[model samples]
Target: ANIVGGIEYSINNASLCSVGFSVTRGATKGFVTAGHCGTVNATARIGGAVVGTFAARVFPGNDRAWVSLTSAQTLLPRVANGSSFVTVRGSTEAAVGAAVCRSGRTTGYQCGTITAKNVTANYAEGAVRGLGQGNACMGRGDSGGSWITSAGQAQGVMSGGNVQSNGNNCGIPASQRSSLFERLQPILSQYGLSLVTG
Candidate 1:
């Protein structure tokens, strides 16, 4: 199977998490995802096939990481949209209140509006700053998913969210749920990586 953005992947068969977007650094090709998903040098695989390795990762302070794929694997600038796929045109930060959508392995596809920016999320590990806040519903195995605008602008990657007490519900009201994502621009800059536009 092809390793594209917004799909489910495992790190050393430890746990499943969603893939973010494709990225590049000179001749090296890789994908960006939430750092909380794995640590540096962790082997990334899809369907039992080794695909990449975590080249860089940072958790708590910032949930961002880059996976450098092997030459045998290929990265695509596309995100899973339900049963179809959407091309990622660019990485452009959306303004507050702008409509946005995300694709996760568990929740599939969902849409919501950007509620805030430069938000900080206090996870169990520590605090992550400079994240984009949204109202979309996401659950376990959804981290590292793509946050994009309707017009195909890459926004961020899923960092964390408020888990409902019931444990079986994900369609909570926007006012009650808080979704946090690490902004893509700053991550790209930090790693000297560029988003792979379609």
Candidate 2:
């Protein structure tokens, strides 16, 4: 079976996080997730089955990490879009008015537009720079996810977001909310990684 981004994964068999994008380190297939999810060498599991390892990571300074998949895992360059899926063709950051959609393991899917760019996410750990801002309703509770353009281009990885007034749930409208996604290029460039496309 092929696994796409937004698949729920556990770090060291605990804590929920979603796949950011299908990526590869040379010939080894893997996927990207938030570095805040786990540290390097952390075990990644899907349905209790150990599938990959956090080969590299960067936190506080930036929120990005790559989980190098094992032989059992197969990469598919696509992500959940509402009730369907879209093939990721590339990772070119979109403009402020460009349409963007986010997919999560918890929240399912939501689409909005890029509200800003080169944003600094003020997280509890500190400030992370060079993130793309959007109107998608994403929160830490449903984070470590992926975002794509209307034409299926990979954009960024879930970084952080504001929560709801009632509770931790992100039950809010996109226009009234904002979400941050870490840039995909910086992580890929710094780690020498390539996106896995089917």
Candidate 3:
């Protein structure tokens, strides 16, 4: 898979930092990324500044996390608008096998098709379940990126990618993508973060 020019990121050197599509659970507002990326209390940055703070993070069983952004930050919660940039809002969950796209510091914006739903995979970290599977290509820095369907629906956040000798493809199952966010909704609400209207 080829990396898009503007969004290519060296997975190795790319520090645990903020990337695309931020989310709000309550007063705690931040972006979502991969669970194995780092610690819950760990912090990330974008451009040249720190945008959000990591609140609670879970891995192995679930490859997702929420970062509570600082007062100076705002949730730019939106999915791809068909091209490279993001839109303003999100809609309902997408269907299985729907065409999708992703935007990350590593790959920029890559398009592909959904592969499976409710998929569980064993990673070096542990067993991760309820993740969406897709054909999108990603690399190291691509973890914790945004996954969206062609209709502009928020599907899931980029977690990990396969780099097998046979070939590599990104995965985001429909059930896992929708449910993880669903589980996160109440947590965000209690924090006064109404899940973005996507």
Candidate 4:
């Protein structure tokens, strides 16, 4: 239940999603995730223990949120990369065709190429713009996961993906499975938060 980025965290002890990355504003520390994972004031927990609260959340238009961690919780800049770890050095937008990988509780670690940028995704909730598109596979529980490059640059947070015929699987066919993510640069700037780097 340690507080590390790219791991699974429960929102309101109901909705489960992946942590984007550890972040800070002044002395306050917390982690970032997809806003659609939960609403404002939702309790964020690790292994049933309360760790933070959704201080700010923006959905539909943008899928990003900042959780204000409690004093007892510590924020680590590293993300779980399967059996290893990837240190988040900074937020750098990856160029199209660049290799990108994302870590999620459902998929663990998956890599693919960035196929597009500045794209818009229309969901049942609404439309979200300024997203990065990739060919990596992701699933429902993968939202809010960390999207990083092979060089350890923080790219974005998992937003959504196409569902397979089962109506529950994602990233099927691998080549045709496309995913969308909310770019990290804009979210960090808008929240006045800085990525916690090693």
Candidate 5:
């Protein structure tokens, strides 16, 4: 669980993005993140070391993507919670009003309720559909992070948010800090990826 998400990933040495969950495509180890983070076939690195490559990616329409891990990488089913880690069990969707906490490199672990589901978010690039909205505040580097329930059940991945302030600061109030996560079910179903377990 130590190699869990909350780590930063760079694709082709681009801007930093976070891993949502450790998943696999059969025996090949990998992880899932936001589609807007990288392009397919691009080599992804962390700490200037090659960790994997983007096998598939999609944005604008839906924020979902998966990576194929390199031989050197080790996959785990845990997510970072500040200095500690939360073990991942399964991908059981949390219903609305359920308590959920999301993990990210930028925001760490922020807990909130499932305010809404099946929501469509409009970004400058395009509109992404089927997202779940919550009041958890996240920042730029937090994109592609993990969203899990109190039971450590995987739920979604950090998609995007409506940050009305500076790029770094999410907001001051709870309402302004609302964020959206791309449901994990669609990501797994679309990419044929399986989540790692404890």
Candidate 6:
């Protein structure tokens, strides 16, 4: 779903794809990827089926959005790697130098540590502001993927990486990321949606 262009991209592991994340705020069921990733009224497929619709989306200005689930839906609390399921404890904003990890359809799994905070990265879409810098490696299919710390706490969604090294990759800072979830909590709560858990 290209929220900016009003198109839907296939959710495939073979190429560029979108990833989902958990949110405990309000009635919101889950946090979606960049708004540039999909559009409103667009359908999102997870585990190979339509799971929800784009509720709020923004592209050029802000490359993130929210997907409100239609009804009660189930999701894997841990990153899906076909064999082992890592436990997903609740989420918490991580501090600088905090160890972090990211899961994407492309990279599968990789670990790193936070390098900087409130760093902005310029992308083809535009400049992404207030992003957390880390050492995690990522690519196309990594967008909107989960960036979690070793403590089983979630940090942010995978956005993009700098060419310098995986250590310079960027993610949405915990404060801003958490704030987005907090702001949308009320909207999600109205739908009886809650973040998925094991």
Best by the TM-score measure: 1
Which candidate leads in lDDT? Answer: 1
Residue 55, candidate 6: Cα error in Å is 1.2
Model 1 per-residue lDDT at 37: 93
TM-score of each: 0.96, 0.92, 0.72, 0.95, 0.94, 0.69
Clashing pairs in 5: none
Report clash pairs, candidate 2.
none
Task: Give the higher-TM-score candidate: 1 or 4.
Answer: 1
Is 3 or 4 the stronger prediction by TM-score? Answer: 4
True-structure RMSD for candidate 4: 1.4
Which wins on lDDT, candidate 2 or candidate 3? 2
Error of 6 at 84 (Å): 1.8
RMSD of each: 1.3, 1.8, 6.3, 1.4, 1.6, 7.6
Give the per-residue lDDT of model 6 (tens digit) for 81-117.
3345455565567777777777666656666677777
Give the Cα-based TM-score of candidate 2 against the true structure.
0.92
Local accuracy of candidate 3 as per-residue lDDT tens digits, 82-120: 364555245355666677777665545777777677777
lDDT of 5: 0.84
Task: Tell me the deviation in Å of residue 195 in model 1.
Answer: 1.4
Please count the clashing residue pairs in each candidate, in the order shown: 0, 0, 21, 0, 0, 12
RMSD of 1: 1.3
Q: Between candidates 2 and 4, name the one with more favorable TM-score.
A: 4
The predicted structure with the larger TM-score, 1 or 2, is 1
Each prediction's Cα lDDT score? 0.87, 0.82, 0.54, 0.86, 0.84, 0.53
- Model 5 lDDT tens row, 152-189: 89998899887655764346666555689999998898
Query: Model 5: runs farther than 4 Å from truth?
Result: 168-170
Residue pairs with clashing backbones, model 4: none
For residues 1-198, could you state the per-residue lDDT of candidate 4 as single tens digits?
Answer: 456767889988898999999888888988889989989999998888998899998999988998889878777878888888998888878799899998888878888889998888899999999899998888778889899987889999999888676643453676777699999888888889999888
Model 1 agreement with the true structure over 82-176: per-residue lDDT tens digits: 88888899987899989998888988887888999888888889999988988887888889999998799999999988877654126678887
Return the lDDT, model 1, position 134. Answer: 87
Instruction: State the local distance difference test value for candidate 1.
Output: 0.87
